Enzyme design. Structure first.
Site, PDB file in Angstrom:
ATOM      1  CG  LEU A  69      -2.168  -1.020   1.310  1.00 42.18           C
ATOM      2  CD1 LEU A  69      -2.717  -1.004   2.638  1.00 42.18           C
ATOM      3  CD2 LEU A  69      -2.975  -0.817   0.188  1.00 42.18           C
ATOM      4  CB  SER A  77       3.217  -0.151   2.916  1.00 40.52           C
ATOM      5  OG  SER A  77       3.977  -0.325   1.533  1.00 40.52           O
ATOM      6  CE  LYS A 101       5.160   1.128  -2.585  1.00 36.09           C
ATOM      7  NZ  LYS A 101       3.941   1.559  -1.537  1.00 36.09           N
ATOM      8  CB  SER A 102      10.202   4.916  -1.198  1.00 34.98           C
ATOM      9  OG  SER A 102       9.590   4.745  -2.282  1.00 34.98           O
ATOM     10  CG  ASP A 122       6.429  10.044  -7.191  1.00 33.47           C
ATOM     11  OD1 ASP A 122       5.693  10.308  -8.023  1.00 33.47           O
ATOM     12  OD2 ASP A 122       7.285  10.888  -6.314  1.00 33.47           O
ATOM     13  NE  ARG A 143      -4.271   2.152  -9.573  1.00 35.21           N
ATOM     14  CZ  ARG A 143      -3.784   2.673  -8.305  1.00 35.21           C
ATOM     15  NH1 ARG A 143      -2.588   2.446  -7.693  1.00 35.21           N
ATOM     16  NH2 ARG A 143      -4.655   3.740  -7.886  1.00 35.21           N
ATOM     17  CB  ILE A 170       1.301   0.728  -5.253  1.00 32.32           C
ATOM     18  CG1 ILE A 170       1.570   2.218  -4.279  1.00 32.32           C
ATOM     19  CG2 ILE A 170       0.120   0.090  -4.569  1.00 32.32           C
ATOM     20  CD1 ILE A 170       0.470   3.346  -4.474  1.00 32.32           C
ATOM     21  CB  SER A 171       3.108  -3.513  -8.391  1.00 31.33           C
ATOM     22  OG  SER A 171       3.928  -3.661  -6.917  1.00 31.33           O
ATOM     23  N   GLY A 183     -10.364   6.279  -6.907  1.00 28.20           N
ATOM     24  CA  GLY A 183      -9.700   5.143  -7.283  1.00 28.20           C
ATOM     25  C   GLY A 183      -8.330   4.885  -6.650  1.00 28.20           C
TER      26      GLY A 183
HETATM   27  N1  LIG Z   1      10.110   0.559   8.697  1.00 28.07           N
HETATM   28  C1  LIG Z   1       9.141   1.968   9.261  1.00 28.07           C
HETATM   29  N2  LIG Z   1       8.766   2.024  10.416  1.00 28.07           N
HETATM   30  C2  LIG Z   1       7.881   3.121  10.719  1.00 28.07           C
HETATM   31  N3  LIG Z   1       7.829   4.196   9.829  1.00 28.07           N
HETATM   32  C3  LIG Z   1       8.112   4.062   8.502  1.00 28.07           C
HETATM   33  C4  LIG Z   1       9.095   2.922   8.236  1.00 28.07           C
HETATM   34  N4  LIG Z   1       9.449   2.918   6.732  1.00 28.07           N
HETATM   35  C5  LIG Z   1       8.844   3.986   6.269  1.00 28.07           C
HETATM   36  N5  LIG Z   1       8.140   4.712   7.474  1.00 28.07           N
HETATM   37  C6  LIG Z   1       7.515   5.901   7.135  1.00 28.07           C
HETATM   38  O1  LIG Z   1       6.309   5.929   6.617  1.00 28.07           O
HETATM   39  C7  LIG Z   1       6.058   6.775   5.431  1.00 28.07           C
HETATM   40  C8  LIG Z   1       6.041   6.271   4.248  1.00 28.07           C
HETATM   41  O2  LIG Z   1       7.060   5.595   3.854  1.00 28.07           O
HETATM   42  P1  LIG Z   1       7.323   5.287   2.391  1.00 28.07           P
HETATM   43  O3  LIG Z   1       8.724   4.672   2.139  1.00 28.07           O
HETATM   44  O4  LIG Z   1       7.385   6.891   1.535  1.00 28.07           O
HETATM   45  O5  LIG Z   1       5.904   4.507   2.022  1.00 28.07           O
HETATM   46  P2  LIG Z   1       5.907   3.833   0.590  1.00 28.07           P
HETATM   47  O6  LIG Z   1       5.330   2.588   0.416  1.00 28.07           O
HETATM   48  O7  LIG Z   1       7.145   4.417  -0.201  1.00 28.07           O
HETATM   49  N6  LIG Z   1       4.608   5.110  -0.094  1.00 28.07           N
HETATM   50  P3  LIG Z   1       4.156   5.417  -1.401  1.00 28.07           P
HETATM   51  O8  LIG Z   1       5.134   6.074  -2.425  1.00 28.07           O
HETATM   52  O9  LIG Z   1       3.078   6.477  -1.725  1.00 28.07           O
HETATM   53  O10 LIG Z   1       3.719   4.073  -2.533  1.00 28.07           O
HETATM   54  C9  LIG Z   1       7.252   7.573   5.645  1.00 28.07           C
HETATM   55  O11 LIG Z   1       6.970   8.907   6.086  1.00 28.07           O
HETATM   56  C10 LIG Z   1       8.332   6.979   6.425  1.00 28.07           C
HETATM   57  O12 LIG Z   1       8.829   7.663   7.426  1.00 28.07           O
HETATM   58  N1  LIG Z   2      -5.073   6.768  -7.165  1.00 29.61           N
HETATM   59  C1  LIG Z   2      -3.709   6.472  -6.688  1.00 29.61           C
HETATM   60  N2  LIG Z   2      -3.362   5.338  -6.315  1.00 29.61           N
HETATM   61  C2  LIG Z   2      -2.257   4.942  -5.612  1.00 29.61           C
HETATM   62  N3  LIG Z   2      -1.264   5.934  -5.429  1.00 29.61           N
HETATM   63  C3  LIG Z   2      -1.225   7.132  -6.112  1.00 29.61           C
HETATM   64  C4  LIG Z   2      -2.721   7.539  -6.546  1.00 29.61           C
HETATM   65  N4  LIG Z   2      -2.623   8.823  -7.432  1.00 29.61           N
HETATM   66  C5  LIG Z   2      -1.482   9.240  -7.154  1.00 29.61           C
HETATM   67  N5  LIG Z   2      -0.764   8.168  -6.263  1.00 29.61           N
HETATM   68  C6  LIG Z   2       0.862   8.573  -6.113  1.00 29.61           C
HETATM   69  O1  LIG Z   2       1.426   7.647  -7.023  1.00 29.61           O
HETATM   70  C7  LIG Z   2       2.325   6.581  -6.296  1.00 29.61           C
HETATM   71  C8  LIG Z   2       2.206   5.363  -6.501  1.00 29.61           C
HETATM   72  O2  LIG Z   2       2.445   5.170  -8.073  1.00 29.61           O
HETATM   73  P1  LIG Z   2       2.746   3.519  -8.544  1.00 29.61           P
HETATM   74  O3  LIG Z   2       3.940   3.093  -7.226  1.00 29.61           O
HETATM   75  O4  LIG Z   2       3.413   3.600  -9.828  1.00 29.61           O
HETATM   76  O5  LIG Z   2       1.431   2.877  -8.304  1.00 29.61           O
HETATM   77  S1  LIG Z   2       1.133   1.746  -9.290  1.00 29.61           S
HETATM   78  O6  LIG Z   2      -0.163   1.128  -8.784  1.00 29.61           O
HETATM   79  O7  LIG Z   2       0.959   2.121 -10.614  1.00 29.61           O
HETATM   80  O8  LIG Z   2       1.967   0.611  -8.975  1.00 29.61           O
HETATM   81  C9  LIG Z   2       1.918   6.798  -4.736  1.00 29.61           C
HETATM   82  O9  LIG Z   2       3.127   7.311  -4.240  1.00 29.61           O
HETATM   83  C10 LIG Z   2       1.026   7.858  -4.832  1.00 29.61           C
HETATM   84  O10 LIG Z   2       1.645   8.979  -4.339  1.00 29.61           O
HETATM   85 MG   LIG Z   3       7.366   5.393  -2.230  1.00 27.91          MG
END
Ligand SMILES: Nc1ncnc2c1ncn2[C@@H]1O[C@H](COP(=O)(O)OP(=O)(O)NP(=O)(O)O)[C@@H](O)[C@H]1O
Ligand SMILES: Nc1ncnc2c1ncn2[C@@H]1O[C@H](COP(=O)(O)OS(=O)(=O)O)[C@@H](O)[C@H]1O
Ligand SMILES: [Mg+2]
Ligand SMILES: Nc1ncnc2c1ncn2[C@@H]1O[C@H](COP(=O)(O)OP(=O)(O)NP(=O)(O)O)[C@@H](O)[C@H]1O
Ligand SMILES: Nc1ncnc2c1ncn2[C@@H]1O[C@H](COP(=O)(O)OS(=O)(=O)O)[C@@H](O)[C@H]1O
Ligand SMILES: [Mg+2]
Lengths: 191, 191
Positions: free
Chosen positions: A24, A27, A29-30, A53, A70, A96-97, A146
Site C-alpha cells: 500500500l 507501507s 516501500k521507498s 513515483d 497501472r 504499489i503494484s 480510485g
Molecule cells: N520501517 C518503518 N517504520 C516506521 N515508519 C516507517 C517505516 N518505513 C517508512 N516509514 C514511514 O512511513 C512513511 C511512508 O514511507 P514510504 O517509504 O514513503 O512509503 P511508500 O510505500 O514508499 N509510499 P508510496 O510512495 O505512496 O507508495 C514515511 O514517512 C516513512 O517515514
Molecule cells: N489513485 C492512486 N493510487 C495510488 N497511488 C497514487 C494514486 N494517485 C497518485 N498516487 C501516487 O503515486 C504513487 C504510486 O505510484 P505507483 O507506485 O507507480 O502505483 S502503481 O499502482 O501504478 O504501481 C503513490 O506514491 C502515490 O503518491
Molecule cells: Mg514510495
C-alpha cells in the site's frame, strides 16, 4: 553479443536480480528500498532503484492511475527491471503494484530465482495513520478517485519470498538486514 | 536515497553515459555496439546494449513501425538509457531512430556531455547491398510498407559527436577503437 550476463556478474562480483517491493501507499516501500541500497552499496554491491513515483515522471510520464495504466506501469517496470538484472545489477523496484496478475507477469519475465517479491505487510490503518503525503485524506474526501486501498483493490502476494513490517517497530535498517541476509544466503552477493 | 550517481561511479570507476548509435537498417549499428561492448569489457568497464530489435520484443513489444510508434520507441529507449546512465553504466543504444526531433529529445533528457550521438554514416546503397535480413528487398517489393530509407525518411544527425563508416573497409574493431579513444579522452572511463 559476446559479452554475457555471467561476464558482467564476474566483473561486479554479484548476481543480477530483481527485488520487487510491493505494498500500500505509506507501507514503507521507498524507505526500505533506500535502506537496502545503502547497505548493499557499503558491501560494494551495485544496486539501482526503480521507484514508481520517479519512473512516473520519466519513462511512464504518459500513464495515469486508471487500472489499465497501472497494469502498463507495472509491465514496463518489470521489463526495465529485467534489463537491469541482465546487466548484472541488483534492481530494486518499489511500486504499489496492486494487482497480483501483473506482479506475477513480471516474475515470469525472469528465470526462476531471479525475482524476489518483497511484501510490505503493513495494514491499511497504519499506512493511513502515517499518510506522509496526505493522500489517504484526499482519497477519503473524494478529491482523489480510485485510490489503492480505498476505492481500488490491493491484492497481496500469495507466495512472496520475503514479508516485512508485520509486527511493530521493525526499523528500515533491521528490515534491510533481513533482505540482505536473504540475498547473501541465496548467493546473489557474489559472482 | 543517500546513494548518488557519483557513488555508483566511484564503485565502477567509470562515468554513466548514453552512447546513442543511429543509422539506416544495415548500417552496422549492432555490429559496432558489440565491438564496443567487447572492448570496454576487456578494459574492465561495464556497458549494456539497448538494441532496437531486442527491446521491441520486451518493453516495446506493444509498438509498431508507424511513425508515432517509432517516436514512442525512441522516447522509451531514451528514458531507459537515462536510467542506466544514472546507475553509472555506459549504455549503448542501437536503434535506427530515424527522426531528428526524437533523438534530440533523448539528448535533452541528459546533462550536457552525457549523451554521445554516434552516426553510422553508411549510404543507403551500401546498406541495401548488405541487406543481411532481406528487408530492403521486401520493402522494394511492397511487402514491407513504410520502411526507413525507402518509404519513410531517415534524418541524419546535424551535429553528432562521432561519425563512423564513411570511407571503405573501416572495421568494426577500428570503429570501436575510435569510440573508446573518444570516451577515454572525455574522461568517461574513470570515476
Ligand atoms: N520501517 C518503518 N517504520 C516506521 N515508519 C516507517 C517505516 N518505513 C517508512 N516509514 C514511514 O512511513 C512513511 C511512508 O514511507 P514510504 O517509504 O514513503 O512509503 P511508500 O510505500 O514508499 N509510499 P508510496 O510512495 O505512496 O507508495 C514515511 O514517512 C516513512 O517515514
Ligand atoms: N489513485 C492512486 N493510487 C495510488 N497511488 C497514487 C494514486 N494517485 C497518485 N498516487 C501516487 O503515486 C504513487 C504510486 O505510484 P505507483 O507506485 O507507480 O502505483 S502503481 O499502482 O501504478 O504501481 C503513490 O506514491 C502515490 O503518491
Ligand atoms: Mg514510495
Ligand atoms: N564495419 C562493417 N564493415 C562491413 N560490414 C559490416 C560492418 N558492420 C556491420 N557490417 C555488416 O553489415 C550487416 C549489418 O550489420 P548490423 O550491425 O546488423 O546492422 P544494423 O545497423 O544493426 N541493422 P538493423 O538492426 O536492421 O538496424 C551485418 O551483416 C554486418 O556483417
Ligand atoms: N518498416 C521498418 N523500418 C525499419 N526497420 C524495420 C521495419 N520493419 C521491421 N524493421 C526491423 O526492426 C528493426 C528496427 O527497429 P528499430 O531500431 O527499433 O527502429 S526504430 O525506427 O523504431 O528506431 C530493424 O532491424 C528492422 O529489421
Ligand atoms: Mg541491428
Amino acid at each position: 553479443c559476446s559479452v554475457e550476463k555471467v561476464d558482467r556478474q564476474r566483473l561486479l562480483d554479484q548476481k543480477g536480480c530483481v527485488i520487487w517491493v510491493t505494498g500500500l501507499s505509506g507501507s514503507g516501500k521507498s524507505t526500505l528500498a533506500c535502506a537496502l541500497n545503502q547497505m548493499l552499496y557499503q558491501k560494494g554491491k551495485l544496486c539501482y532503484i526503480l521507484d514508481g513515483d520517479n519512473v512516473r515522471h520519466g519513462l511512464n510520464r504518459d500513464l495515469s492511475f486508471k487500472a489499465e495504466d497501472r497494469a502498463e506501469n507495472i509491465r514496463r517496470v518489470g521489463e526495465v527491471a529485467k534489463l537491469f538484472a541482465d546487466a548484472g545489477i541488483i534492481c530494486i523496484a518499489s511500486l504499489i503494484s496492486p494487482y497480483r496478475t501483473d506482479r506475477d507477469a513480471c516474475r515470469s519475465l525472469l528465470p526462476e530465482g531471479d525475482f524476489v517479491e518483497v511484501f510490505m505487510d503493513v495494514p491499511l490503518s497504519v499506512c493511513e495513520a502515517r499518510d506522509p503525503k496526505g493522500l489517504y485524506k484526499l482519497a477519503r474526501a473524494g478529491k482523489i478517485k480510485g485510490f489503492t486501498g480505498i476505492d481500488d483493490p490491493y491484492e497481496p502476494p500469495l507466495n512472496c519470498e520475503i514479508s516485512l513490517g508485520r509486527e511493530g517497530g521493525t526499523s528500515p535498517i533491521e528490515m534491510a538486514e533481513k533482505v540482505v541476509g536473504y540475498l547473501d544466503n541465496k548467493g546473489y552477493l557474489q559472482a
